[PDB]
Design a protein around this ligand. Sequence first.
Ligand SMILES: [Cl-]
Ligand SMILES: [Zn+2]
Ligand SMILES: [Zn+2]
Length: 445
Amino acid sequence: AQWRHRRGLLPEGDPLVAALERLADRPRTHVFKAVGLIDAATGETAPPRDLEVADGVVAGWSPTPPRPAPYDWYVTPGFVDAHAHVSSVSDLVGLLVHGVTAYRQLWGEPAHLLAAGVHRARHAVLPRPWVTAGVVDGPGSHVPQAATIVSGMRDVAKVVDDVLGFGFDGIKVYDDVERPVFEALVRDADRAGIPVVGHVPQAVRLDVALRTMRSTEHLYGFVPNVFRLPAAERWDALADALRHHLAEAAGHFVCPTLVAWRARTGERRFTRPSRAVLQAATPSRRPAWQAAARDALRLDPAEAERRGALVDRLGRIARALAEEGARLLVGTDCGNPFVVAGPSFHKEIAELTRAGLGFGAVLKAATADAYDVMGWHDKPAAGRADLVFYRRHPDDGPTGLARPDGVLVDGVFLDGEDLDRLWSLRLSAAGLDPSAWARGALDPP
Ligand SMILES: [Cl-]
Ligand SMILES: [Zn+2]
Ligand SMILES: [Zn+2]
């Protein structure tokens, strides 16, 4: 049914789709005066230059004439959510409003390729996807319904056929892929130029996974995927793993999704489960989110504190990996309970900076290194005009990067009132009064 429903992210008659279609009729040619381009690696700002955008491509920079000219704008490359589960147009709007102009879809379907076609066609304003061919897992998978079960070379070949035939961007592996099958998959994907991402399989050595996979997610491998265990043992098992706990990761892309770990604990300090966030969830997600809310309500505060401390340690592991030369990415697992597409991206920046990552490092993870892991080798602020605009430097002020004053998406400029209106519509469509969740707040106050 994946072909019949391939337009499922952009359903006819939907008000959010209609808004994104109207926005795609906007001009894609601009001049922005006195722009300070923030260097995606260092966080320093180039001198003020006038930015020329032509048909959605960065055409050039003209020095702003002096009296040294002040900055009218500070600009970053567009952000990349390196681990998103986009299932509805609500998610697409949430990402755009928060400056996320591209995402890795780590459970890809034909519907995401369709969305990529809409992006190429300029028929709606939306973030650009990087799409896996579903997810590959072994027999004994914990997700056998949703996973493509691979147990030999012919099964591996069929996945490579789908990737190369339909233009998927990579292959995602799950925990129960058998070791001989993994070895054949990474050998054959490598020969075909296909990146392999996902979970370090239980049957695979960490060092082998680090040198063969384009990226590894959730810190699995460094720590166990305790969510494969019964609920009552999970956090004890994580505590034990950390009790017994990097330079092998130098140069490798690591997407820790700390915001998702935090939300799975049932803690409330940073995840802030609430009736308002449940109202904002899409109808298909509300049952699972409500069940998670019940778990959070029932959790003894002392245990919540214990689990939060374990996720803090995961963040320090992510920092230590970066200090050894690993290449961190900012991904959210948005769609998981109380991980909201858009704000969760900035929650993950907050997790990484709480762990000690500086502004420049987290900006590089949000942008330049994500374009590299996706194989998009235009310079981060060149080629397609995907950029985020701020009237004040985003390393100052209360919202950081989370409240752009503009987002340029393939040349369409969404100004602050456009961003307010899109966010308000995203909330109203889900049944939440927009005044309950001002743009720039990461949770409804
Ligand atoms: Cl409840
Ligand atoms: Zn995962
Ligand atoms: Zn995921």
